[PDB]
Scaffold this motif. Structure first.
Motif, PDB file in Angstrom:
ATOM      1  N   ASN A  43       0.536  -1.367   0.130  1.00 51.57           N
ATOM      2  CA  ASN A  43      -0.034  -0.362   0.028  1.00 51.57           C
ATOM      3  C   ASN A  43       1.085   1.164  -0.477  1.00 51.57           C
ATOM      4  OD1 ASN A  43      -2.426  -1.612  -0.057  1.00 51.57           O
ATOM      5  ND2 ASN A  43      -2.312  -1.173   2.141  1.00 51.57           N
ATOM      6  N   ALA A  44       2.097   1.635   1.184  1.00 50.98           N
ATOM      7  CA  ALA A  44       3.111   2.217   0.722  1.00 50.98           C
ATOM      8  C   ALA A  44       3.908   2.275  -0.540  1.00 50.98           C
ATOM      9  CB  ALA A  44       3.715   2.200   1.645  1.00 50.98           C
ATOM     10  N   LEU A  45       4.111   1.237  -1.183  1.00 47.13           N
ATOM     11  CA  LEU A  45       4.245   1.677  -2.962  1.00 47.13           C
ATOM     12  C   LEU A  45       3.396   2.417  -3.654  1.00 47.13           C
ATOM     13  CD1 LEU A  45       7.065  -1.075  -2.624  1.00 47.13           C
ATOM     14  CD2 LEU A  45       8.096   1.226  -2.422  1.00 47.13           C
ATOM     15  N   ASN A  46       2.095   1.774  -3.453  1.00 44.18           N
ATOM     16  CA  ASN A  46       1.370   1.786  -5.164  1.00 44.18           C
ATOM     17  C   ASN A  46       0.824   2.846  -4.392  1.00 44.18           C
ATOM     18  OD1 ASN A  46      -1.573   2.122  -5.705  1.00 44.18           O
ATOM     19  ND2 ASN A  46      -0.511   0.969  -6.455  1.00 44.18           N
ATOM     20  N   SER A  47       0.337   4.001  -3.425  1.00 46.43           N
ATOM     21  CA  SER A  47      -0.331   5.018  -2.840  1.00 46.43           C
ATOM     22  C   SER A  47       1.277   6.256  -3.268  1.00 46.43           C
ATOM     23  CB  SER A  47      -0.212   5.456  -1.258  1.00 46.43           C
ATOM     24  OG  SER A  47      -1.609   3.890  -0.503  1.00 46.43           O
ATOM     25  N   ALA A  48       2.174   5.899  -2.242  1.00 42.33           N
ATOM     26  CA  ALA A  48       3.554   7.089  -2.379  1.00 42.33           C
ATOM     27  C   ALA A  48       4.022   7.458  -4.535  1.00 42.33           C
ATOM     28  CB  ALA A  48       3.971   6.862  -1.620  1.00 42.33           C
ATOM     29  N   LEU A  49       4.248   5.990  -5.292  1.00 38.01           N
ATOM     30  CA  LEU A  49       5.176   5.833  -6.282  1.00 38.01           C
ATOM     31  C   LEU A  49       4.002   5.677  -6.903  1.00 38.01           C
ATOM     32  CD1 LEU A  49       8.115   5.007  -4.052  1.00 38.01           C
ATOM     33  CD2 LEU A  49       7.743   7.176  -4.917  1.00 38.01           C
ATOM     34  N   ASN A  50       2.990   4.882  -7.442  1.00 29.49           N
ATOM     35  CA  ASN A  50       2.250   3.830  -7.796  1.00 29.49           C
ATOM     36  C   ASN A  50       3.225   2.616  -8.093  1.00 29.49           C
ATOM     37  OD1 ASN A  50      -0.394   3.844  -9.474  1.00 29.49           O
ATOM     38  ND2 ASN A  50       0.386   5.461 -10.821  1.00 29.49           N
ATOM     39  N   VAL A  51       3.631   1.662  -7.064  1.00 29.15           N
ATOM     40  CA  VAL A  51       3.879   0.497  -7.903  1.00 29.15           C
ATOM     41  C   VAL A  51       3.209  -0.351  -8.016  1.00 29.15           C
ATOM     42  CG1 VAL A  51       5.942  -1.333  -6.746  1.00 29.15           C
ATOM     43  CG2 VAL A  51       6.299   1.605  -6.731  1.00 29.15           C
ATOM     44  N   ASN A  52       3.549  -1.365  -8.727  1.00 28.46           N
ATOM     45  CA  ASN A  52       2.176  -2.338  -8.827  1.00 28.46           C
ATOM     46  C   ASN A  52       2.412  -3.340  -8.353  1.00 28.46           C
ATOM     47  OD1 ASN A  52       1.123  -4.900 -10.075  1.00 28.46           O
ATOM     48  ND2 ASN A  52       1.871  -4.130 -12.166  1.00 28.46           N
ATOM     49  N   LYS A  53       1.717  -3.828  -8.247  1.00 30.12           N
ATOM     50  CA  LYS A  53       1.196  -4.269  -6.248  1.00 30.12           C
ATOM     51  C   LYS A  53       1.720  -5.647  -6.516  1.00 30.12           C
ATOM     52  CE  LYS A  53      -3.185  -2.557  -4.510  1.00 30.12           C
ATOM     53  NZ  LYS A  53      -2.917  -1.073  -3.491  1.00 30.12           N
ATOM     54  N   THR A  54       1.440  -6.397  -6.920  1.00 28.82           N
ATOM     55  CA  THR A  54       2.698  -7.595  -7.774  1.00 28.82           C
ATOM     56  C   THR A  54       4.379  -6.762  -7.921  1.00 28.82           C
ATOM     57  OG1 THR A  54       1.248  -8.269  -9.573  1.00 28.82           O
ATOM     58  CG2 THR A  54       4.119  -8.377  -9.516  1.00 28.82           C
ATOM     59  N   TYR A 163      15.986   4.743  -8.751  1.00 28.32           N
ATOM     60  CA  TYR A 163      15.465   6.234  -8.611  1.00 28.32           C
ATOM     61  C   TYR A 163      15.160   7.204  -9.805  1.00 28.32           C
ATOM     62  CZ  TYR A 163      20.758   7.209 -10.710  1.00 28.32           C
ATOM     63  OH  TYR A 163      21.582   7.924 -10.647  1.00 28.32           O
ATOM     64  N   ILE A 164      15.437   6.234 -11.080  1.00 29.90           N
ATOM     65  CA  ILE A 164      14.896   6.892 -12.170  1.00 29.90           C
ATOM     66  C   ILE A 164      13.423   6.876 -12.243  1.00 29.90           C
ATOM     67  CG2 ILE A 164      15.345   6.973 -15.273  1.00 29.90           C
ATOM     68  CD1 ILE A 164      18.390   6.451 -14.325  1.00 29.90           C
ATOM     69  N   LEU A 165      13.134   6.296 -12.359  1.00 33.72           N
ATOM     70  CA  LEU A 165      11.803   5.380 -12.725  1.00 33.72           C
ATOM     71  C   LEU A 165      11.249   5.907 -11.664  1.00 33.72           C
ATOM     72  CD1 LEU A 165      10.154   3.375 -14.377  1.00 33.72           C
ATOM     73  CD2 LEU A 165      11.293   1.625 -12.764  1.00 33.72           C
ATOM     74  N   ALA A 166      10.957   5.471 -10.435  1.00 30.21           N
ATOM     75  CA  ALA A 166      10.330   5.985  -9.663  1.00 30.21           C
ATOM     76  C   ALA A 166      10.762   7.848  -9.131  1.00 30.21           C
ATOM     77  CB  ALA A 166      10.791   6.011  -7.886  1.00 30.21           C
ATOM     78  N   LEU A 167      10.849   8.920  -9.641  1.00 29.59           N
ATOM     79  CA  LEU A 167      11.331  10.154 -10.301  1.00 29.59           C
ATOM     80  C   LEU A 167      11.534  10.973 -10.869  1.00 29.59           C
ATOM     81  CD1 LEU A 167      13.881  11.374  -6.645  1.00 29.59           C
ATOM     82  CD2 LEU A 167      11.316  10.985  -6.662  1.00 29.59           C
ATOM     83  N   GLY A 168      11.243   9.933 -12.129  1.00 26.34           N
ATOM     84  CA  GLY A 168      12.091  10.812 -13.486  1.00 26.34           C
ATOM     85  C   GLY A 168      10.876  10.206 -14.409  1.00 26.34           C
ATOM     86  N   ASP A 169      11.819  10.056 -15.408  1.00 29.85           N
ATOM     87  CA  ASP A 169      10.493   9.639 -16.792  1.00 29.85           C
ATOM     88  C   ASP A 169      11.127   8.143 -17.410  1.00 29.85           C
ATOM     89  OD1 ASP A 169      10.766   9.872 -20.136  1.00 29.85           O
ATOM     90  OD2 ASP A 169       8.880  10.910 -19.273  1.00 29.85           O
ATOM     91  N   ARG A 170      11.099   7.160 -17.707  1.00 26.86           N
ATOM     92  CA  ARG A 170      10.969   5.891 -17.568  1.00 26.86           C
ATOM     93  C   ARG A 170      11.702   6.100 -19.101  1.00 26.86           C
ATOM     94  NH1 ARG A 170       5.737   3.375 -15.867  1.00 26.86           N
ATOM     95  NH2 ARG A 170       5.576   5.271 -14.870  1.00 26.86           N
ATOM     96  N   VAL A 171      10.825   7.101 -20.449  1.00 27.29           N
ATOM     97  CA  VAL A 171      10.483   6.815 -21.772  1.00 27.29           C
ATOM     98  C   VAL A 171      12.559   7.439 -22.248  1.00 27.29           C
ATOM     99  CG1 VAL A 171       9.556   6.579 -23.829  1.00 27.29           C
ATOM    100  CG2 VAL A 171       8.816   6.626 -22.053  1.00 27.29           C
ATOM    101  N   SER A 172      12.597   8.517 -21.914  1.00 28.22           N
ATOM    102  CA  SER A 172      13.578   9.315 -21.839  1.00 28.22           C
ATOM    103  C   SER A 172      14.873   8.628 -20.454  1.00 28.22           C
ATOM    104  CB  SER A 172      13.404  10.835 -21.786  1.00 28.22           C
ATOM    105  OG  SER A 172      13.002  10.935 -20.127  1.00 28.22           O
ATOM    106  N   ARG A 197       3.794  11.889  -8.346  1.00 28.64           N
ATOM    107  CA  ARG A 197       3.666  10.871  -8.384  1.00 28.64           C
ATOM    108  C   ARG A 197       3.745  10.120  -9.833  1.00 28.64           C
ATOM    109  NH1 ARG A 197      -1.111   7.677  -8.622  1.00 28.64           N
ATOM    110  NH2 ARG A 197      -1.310   5.780  -7.340  1.00 28.64           N
ATOM    111  N   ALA A 198       4.761   9.527 -10.350  1.00 33.28           N
ATOM    112  CA  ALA A 198       4.343   8.775 -11.727  1.00 33.28           C
ATOM    113  C   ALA A 198       2.339   8.721 -11.855  1.00 33.28           C
ATOM    114  CB  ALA A 198       4.994   7.211 -11.745  1.00 33.28           C
ATOM    115  N   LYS A 199       2.196   9.019 -13.553  1.00 35.43           N
ATOM    116  CA  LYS A 199       0.888   8.989 -13.528  1.00 35.43           C
ATOM    117  C   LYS A 199       0.599   7.312 -14.348  1.00 35.43           C
ATOM    118  CE  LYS A 199       2.242  11.947 -17.650  1.00 35.43           C
ATOM    119  NZ  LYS A 199       1.194  11.065 -18.670  1.00 35.43           N
ATOM    120  N   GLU A 200       1.847   6.674 -14.129  1.00 35.17           N
ATOM    121  CA  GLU A 200       1.635   5.460 -15.140  1.00 35.17           C
ATOM    122  C   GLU A 200       1.755   4.302 -13.985  1.00 35.17           C
ATOM    123  OE1 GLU A 200       3.579   7.381 -17.710  1.00 35.17           O
ATOM    124  OE2 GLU A 200       1.625   8.060 -19.449  1.00 35.17           O
ATOM    125  N   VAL A 201       1.763   3.461 -13.724  1.00 35.59           N
ATOM    126  CA  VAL A 201       1.909   2.232 -12.873  1.00 35.59           C
ATOM    127  C   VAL A 201       3.469   1.900 -13.242  1.00 35.59           C
ATOM    128  CG1 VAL A 201       1.695   0.105 -12.597  1.00 35.59           C
ATOM    129  CG2 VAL A 201      -0.688   1.370 -12.209  1.00 35.59           C
TER     130      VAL A 201
END
Ligand code: HEM
Ligand SMILES: [Mg+2]
Length: 217
Positions: A43-54, A163-172, A197-201
């Motif tokens: 719940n913490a990783l999902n609520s704060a960072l949009n980390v997939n629950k899996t 740190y790139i994925l949680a705070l930045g842009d995963r495509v660039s 917070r990341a708009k994409e899971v």
């Protein structure tokens, strides 16, 4: 949540992960850093960072291996500090265990070396990979007990991707330098600087592709 933050007090456990420390300071995780369950982690990783629950469950399953208590269904943040379980040499912001038997306290001298590879206001995959490699080379040259196991190395690559994925842009594959520095040095989310917070899971596949780009660089 995002709107609360206070530093740890005596009895509050903290560990070697800048992000889990940050999430406890915000109360996404228990502020005392103790009795962290699968449900609380997910719940913490999902609520704060949009980390997939899996993904959150998989990370919990790693974390709980560090609890020294038999049959434990939880972990405390300082369990993560046990040397060479999940923690490993050549960290970006902590000293190797060898030097002072402290692989958990934030170390500004170490982090300053890492920051010297972040030459521009935006960090890219190449600069991120350079910083990590420089830390590996430095530990290898100065720590007579240096080890980076196959799994430790995989963890090390994953942490730079994280740190790139949680705070930045995963495509660039880019992230603002100031936000990463803020996370490490304050263990607070860089909300006032504009981070959202990341708009994409964030899922296993996202972490895998970015980790492989750091490796390739
Ligand atoms: C339950 C989830 C997590 C666990 C169990 C965990 C565990 C750890 C551990 C044990 C370390 C120390 C590795 C070392 O020796 O450097 C670490 C470092 C790190 N973690 Fe986490 N972590 C989690 C989630 C995250 C997330 C969501 C982020 C996103 C930014 C993150 C970012 C980092 C970074 C950047 C480092 C490197 C610290 C350094 O090299 O000084 N972690 N993590
Ligand atoms: Mg370490």
């Amino acid at each position: 949540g995002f709107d609360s933050w206070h530093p740890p007090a005596p009895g509050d456990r903290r560990g070697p992960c800048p992000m889990l420390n940050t999430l406890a300071n915000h109360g996404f995780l228990p502020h005392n850093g103790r009795n962290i369950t699968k449900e609380i982690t997910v719940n913490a990783l999902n609520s704060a960072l949009n980390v997939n629950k899996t993904l959150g469950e998989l990370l919990f399953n790693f974390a709980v291996t560090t609890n020294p208590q038999p049959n434990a269904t939880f972990f405390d943040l300082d369990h993560l500090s046990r040397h060479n379980i999940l923690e490993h040499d050549a960290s970006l912001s902590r000293a190797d265990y060898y030097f002072g038997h402290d692989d958990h306290t934030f170390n500004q001298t170490v982090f300053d070396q890492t920051k010297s590879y972040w030459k521009t206001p935006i960090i890219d995959v190449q600069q991120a990979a350079n910083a990590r490699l420089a830390r590996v080379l430095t530990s290898n040259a100065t720590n007579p007990t240096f080890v980076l196991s196959q799994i430790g190395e995989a963890f090390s690559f994953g942490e730079t991707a994280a740190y790139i994925l949680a705070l930045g842009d995963r495509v660039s594959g880019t992230v603002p330098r100031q936000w990463v520095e803020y996370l490490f040095e304050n263990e607070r989310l860089p909300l006032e600087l504009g981070w959202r917070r990341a708009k994409e899971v964030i899922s296993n596949s996202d972490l895998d592709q970015l980790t492989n780009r750091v490796i390739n660089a």
